[PDB]
Each structure stands twice: as structure tokens, then as C-alpha cells.
């Protein structure tokens, strides 16, 4: 029968102290979860596995020289007036490398296609359930490499106060480059983080003070470039006054997914619905941040619509509203939101009490991030998976698909809704 065991855990320091102040975007995650995403590889031929594991360890240490935050620790100071400060010490305490073996477990055991994510996937990551504020002691980066019968899985656990999704995949891209033989990564990080005024740091903040919580399931759906292009043309074709085809491919897809979920759940048309986009500030500040600004740089944009209007008003109207919410995340709004946060620096609560699955839907990650170029020397990955640790939030996570211009979405919802989506011919997914 199949089994899973850890064979070794090793501290990995940078191959070759500095302090980093954290801004509002970074602090907001202190009480929340890590980023856990990983890559599946098939080994067509035999591989010298001990040498492969050693090569991943040494290239990881080399990459860490260029990303010192991932080898450091958080420093939190708690004060008597119920406030706190936090920063990153690049003290080279080290990341963690975990070597696991999944005896008699295969690629296809992990990647049940058109099926739900199997429970084994969650055990391909280490430090599940650890909040980002525990980075004062816990490594900010854990890599778990799990040997399979016909390949390996490379699963990263990354502290979400240090990095967002963009910065996560910057590190993965650069590590694969170093592993392939590059001497430097092709994109170097910008480590200095953004504050409206140099006097703002260290920010003194306060900690603290769901429908089907603990019972959600996770399933992938694949969207071809053609089906996406169909959705974009339809959405722009429905909103003509005042358009030169400004609704984007992703806006139309997300509008379609929103409509499909709500249609499958069958809810009262008077329900108010909240759709949570994460809008990058890097390109929207004036002056803009560096493209490879390393840290968090995104703010929620909340799309609010009645269920009746969402469905009866047509795809283009939903996508146009999302477009407009995105367009309101201007340089003015970003800086004023920052300033009012400094005036009431409380870390958020996870929000309202939800009574159905479509009520509050969070949209995470991006199809812009480079998933399939992560060749460490043995070929491109077959797939990307997350830990699927989250069983509380109704959530859609966006991934680049294997074929050019396609998108995989990882959907966390009640089981019967995922079943309805898989049986819905209006859901334009494939395979
Ligand atoms: C009246 C309105 C306008 O309809 C109201 C009704 C209520 C709501 C629906 C809005 C609130 O208004 C504000 C709101 C968005 C919350 C506060 C957070 O949002 C941040 O709030 C702070 C202020 O506290 C702002 O300064 C930031 O700009 C903003 O982004 C966010 C994040 C950043 C933690 C977000 O995190 C991702 O989790 C998943 C990971 O996979 C990702 O990687 C990671 O990012 C999860 C959702 C979540 C918890 C919630 C939930 C929804 C809320 C509760 O809208």
C-alpha cells in the first residue's frame, strides 16, 4: 500500500545585519495563512535522485543570497498599550528544506483529473496551519520535496508577510534559473518597501480585537484560450455605449465564473453578493513601484451586486462593473487608504458572518505568474497545486494553464456546488 514519511529536515542558509521595514500591505497578513503552492514533475527516464535532492538544496542556498528575507525571521515587539511593531531581520537564520518520500504514490494519484483535489496533496507541504506572525521563530520559507514513483513534487510554504503571489513566483522563477545554471537571476528583487513618508516606519499597529466552515472541498477547472476569447468578445459585445472593447480576458472570465457559481447555488435574487479582487498597486502608484518590488502590494477591490442583477443583467454588465472597480483603484485611493489605515492601525477581522457560499467570494493569485517555465534541469512541470489547507473561505485561485493563454482555476466551495458546476454546460470549462 502507499505511505508517506519525512526522511530529513535541513536548515538552508544563504550561500552569501540588514533590516526591512514592513508596510500596511505586509502587516495585514500577520494573523493569516502562508502561501503554499508547488509544482509536479514527471520523470520519464530514471533519475539519480540523491543527486537531484542535493542539487535542489545547493541551488536553493545560492538563490537565497539574492533573496535574504527568505533566510531571515520576523521581529515583533509588543507594547503595554496593546500595540506592536514588526520588521524582517535578514539574520541568515535560514530556510527549511524537507525531504519526503511517498512510497507507491504516483503523479496520477496526485492529479485526479476532473476530480477533486485528493487529501494527499495537503501533505505535500510543511507547516500547514502556521500563522505568519509565527515567523519570529519559524522559517519564512519551507521547501518540501516529495519523491513519487514517477516524479517529484516541489512544495513551498512562504510567509505571506514577506511575499505576495507575484513575489512568490519571482523567487520560484529565479531558483529554477539558478538550478539550470544561471549565475544570477534574470530579475533581481527590489527589497525596500513603500511608505508614503519615511517617518511612517516602524508602523505601530494593533492585533485582533463562515458558511460551511471546515466542510469545503477543492476542485480544479480548466479554461482554454478559445473559450476565454469567446467570453471576452461576448462581454464586450454586450456593452457597446462607451466601449472600444475595454473589458479584458480575465475580467470576462471572472464575471462568468461569478455568474456560474451563483446560478449553481440557486439563491434568492435579492441577496447581496461580494466579490473580492486583489488589485496590484505596483503599476498604479505615481511614481510606480518597481516591477520586481518584493513584498505585498495589493488592495481589495470589492465588487457588490444583487444576485438578481448579476444573472439577469448579462455577462458584459458584470465584467464592466469589475472593470470599473479596478479602474477606481487609483493613485489617490491607494495613498488615502494607506493614510487612514495609519490613523486606525488595526489588523482586519476576516469580515462578515456568511450564510451561503456565493455571499463572499475571494479571488487570489494571477494567471500572469510564470508557472510552467520553472525548469530546474529536469524539464517543465506537469501541473501546479496548492496545499488546499483552506476549508473556511469560499475562494477562487487563478493559475496559468499549461497551454498558451489558458487558465486553471482552483475552486473551494461546498461539494454539491462543485458537482453542479461540473455538470453545468453553461460553465465553459473543458476536460
Ligand atoms: C462594505 C464593503 C466595502 O462592501 C465591505 C463589506 C465587507 C467587505 C466584503 C470587505 C471589507 O471592506 C474588507 C475585506 C476585503 C477584508 C479585509 C482584507 O482587505 C484589506 O483590508 C484593509 C483594511 O482592513 C485594506 O486596507 C486593504 O486594502 C484590503 O485589501 C481582505 C484580505 C486582504 C485579508 C484578503 O486577503 C487574501 O486572502 C486570501 C489570500 O489567498 C490572499 O493572498 C490574501 O491577500 C482576504 C479578504 C479580506 C478579509 C477581507 C474580507 C472581505 C472584506 C471584509 O467589503
Residue numbers in the entry: 1 to 16, 23 to 215, 221 to 251, 253 to 443
Copy text from the publication.
Here we report a saponin acetyltransferase from Astragalus membranaceus. AmAT7-3 is discovered through a stepwise gene mining approach and characterized as the xylose C3′/C4′-O-acetyltransferse of astragaloside IV. AmAT7-3 is a rare multi-site acetyltransferase which acetylate large saponin molecules. We solved the crystal structures of AmAT7-3 and its variant A310G in complex with astragaloside IV, respectively.
To further elucidate how adjacent amino acids contributed to the conformation of the xylosyl group (Xyl) and regulated the regioselectivity of AmAT7-3, we analyzed the complex structure of AmAT7-3/astragaloside IV. In addition to the established critical role of H166, ten amino acids within 5 Å from the substrate were found to participate in building the internal structure of the active cavity. These amino acids include K407, R38, D311, A312, A310, L290, I34, I288, I374, and A376, which may play a decisive role in determining the substrate conformation. Unlike other acetyltransferases, the amino acids composing the β10 barrel (AADAG) in AmAT7-3 were relatively small in size, resulting in a larger active pocket to accommodate the saponin molecules such as astragaloside IV. Due to the relatively spacious pocket of AmAT7-3, we observed significant rotational motion of the xylosyl sugar ring throughout the MD simulation. Based on the rotation angles, we segregated the substrate into two major conformations using a 75-degree threshold. In conformation-1, the O3′ and O4′ sites formed hydrogen bonds with K407 and H166, respectively. This H-bonding constrained the substrate, positioning the O3′ site in close proximity to Cx, implying a potential site for selective acetylation. Our calculations showed that the reaction was initiated by the proton transfer from sugar O atom to His166, which was coupled to the nucleophilic attack of sugar O onto the acyl Cx, leading to the formation of a tetrahedral intermediate.
